[PDB]
Symmetry: C2
Subunit: 303 residues, 2 copies
């Protein structure tokens, strides 16, 4: 809604950018592990057909398994390439969507995968890391759990890179300025590298498809306020030059998910693209998976 | 609002793409001039500091002056370079914002310029052409007025190019799919080359800044329906590689203007961009210029 008391100038000077934003995190693995205090950490990599990169991501994380990290899972989304065997060969446990939650038939898209991984994991903290990363850094998981383990009151940590992204810069952040202005303090709201506490994640809906990350950001903000969110610098990463046609369909789902969270009536109509004319249509989903907490008791595996 | 009866598939197969969309316009200047039937045509080029390109755009249009075109005006927006003298030297009349409407102090931005040009022009049809075009084609004005002069019931003509644009493809068209799905049939809703009848243009508000084009599209659609809009192929044009930082600020104003037209409460908060951090803020306007018709009677020059 209309917030004429807030300006872009005092968003740039917002105290949150100091106390909840780590440009140069200096935490050690040993001192993070010391702060677990009986909490466990689950790392989840969503994956659909990522055979060329999934092993390299898993290998950056595997040395933490059994110390800082308690579970390392690739949640496979129906890959037909060698994603699964390569993740296993790299030292990760691989769980299909069906095995994560066999009572419920899979919907397509990324959010489904992350939602199901709540039923497959046991960590008090869950870290999500994209499996398509071309050059992952082994300090990702430590930097993401830093504010959860050491700060107070943080429940969602968003990892950003110094160069980000055409959808992030033209779609997500300008819409947040219009609909959730305080969230413009988040550098990369769509980023795939982030960590959350279990109670938070079990009690929010998961948006479908590519809306999942911005949906968690906005639901966490709405539920707990800006102080409960933090961001940390993961380092440098090259913008993978994705086709604008793919980015357009993803943008449409980002819009749908944000409108869904902000009371904006979305038409539900998918995006048409023209290239006479050669038309290309995509679909968009307006239906969340409900909070996983609502399924407690009905599951053959406890939550 | 929610339109679950419409899908992206039947938008791609929409009859409008045949009867109101000209992929290969074949009109001659002589036969268009024959159809004027006493209507006059005003061509308007908005311009702020366009000394390198404005003359070349004017020269592509000047041979039509006195035949198909009755007025050729560059509406200068406070240029400090040689925009004005170069437009004059190319054969255009140059009118400042103040001379267009001296009773009202200028607001910044492009929409202000186009709104003021309604008071400075006399054509029954007004054609807007950007002055920063690097390679304008002399058939722009004929192709834009074709459907106005020959078809029935068209009041707004949008000229598109075969390659368009990151803001168009990731922001404008996906938001239209969410908020005004039928308008996704328009290939380039933000395009600067378009023509409109005077009665229509005098009776709609003009959005400020870079929102002006999408605001006219949505107001025309809301007021008169999709049949009153048409689009024509102008040919090929190179995407001028504008900085993503500029595109982000323009996207924010596009969003504000669309939310303004579609009942979506916009925060009014400008876009912050970060590059410690180096913050960069822009402003956004939620205030239209009212329909120029509302100022009739109060102007020292008649409308
Ligand atoms: N079904 C899908 C599962 C995962 C992903 C992804 O990780 O980007 C995308 C689609
Ligand atoms: N004040 C302005 C006037 C004109 C333009 C433009 O034509 O892009 C931009 C700004
Ligand atoms: Cl502001
Ligand atoms: Cl800091
Ligand atoms: Cl089901
Ligand atoms: Cl992006
Ligand atoms: Cl919580
Ligand atoms: Cl659809
Ligand atoms: Cl046609
Ligand atoms: Cl004034
Ligand atoms: Cl564009
Ligand atoms: Cl009208």
């Amino acid at each position: 809604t209309l917030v004429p008391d807030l300006t872009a100038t005092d968003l740039a000077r917002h105290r949150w950018l100091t106390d909840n934003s780590w440009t140069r995190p200096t935490w050690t693995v040993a001192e993070l592990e010391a702060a677990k205090a009986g909490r466990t950490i689950s790392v989840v990599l969503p994956a659909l057909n990522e055979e060329e990169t999934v092993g390299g991501v898993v290998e950056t994380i595997r040395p933490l398994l059994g110390g800082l990290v308690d579970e390392l899972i690739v949640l496979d989304s129906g890959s037909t390439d060698d994603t699964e065997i390569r993740a296993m060969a790299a030292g990760a446990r691989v769980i299909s969507r069906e095995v994560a939650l066999p009572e419920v038939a899979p919907q397509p898209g990324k959010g489904e995968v992350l939602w199901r991984s709540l039923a497959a994991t046991t960590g008090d903290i869950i870290v999500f890391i994209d499996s398509d990363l071309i050059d992952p850094d082994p300090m990702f998981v430590p930097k993401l759990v830093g504010p959860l383990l050491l700060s107070e009151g943080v429940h969602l940590v968003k990892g950003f890179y110094r160069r980000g992204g055409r959808v992030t810069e033209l779609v997500a952040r300008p819409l947040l300025a219009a609909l959730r202005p305080e969230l413009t303090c988040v550098l990369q709201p769509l980023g795939g590298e982030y960590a959350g506490t279990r109670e938070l994640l079990m009690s929010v809906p998961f948006a479908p498809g590519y809306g999942v990350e911005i949906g968690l950001l906005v639901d966490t903000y709405d539920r707990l306020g800006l102080d409960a969110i933090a961001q940390v610098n993961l380092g440098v990463r090259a913008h993978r030059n994705r086709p604008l046609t793919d980015l357009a369909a993803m943008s449409r789902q980002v819009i749908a998910t944000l409108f869904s969270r902000c009371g904006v009536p979305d038409s539900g109509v998918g995006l048409t693209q023209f290239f006479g004319f050669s038309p290309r249509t995509s679909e968009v989903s307006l239906v969340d998976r409900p909070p996983m907490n609502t399924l407690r008791g009905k599951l053959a595996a406890a939550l």
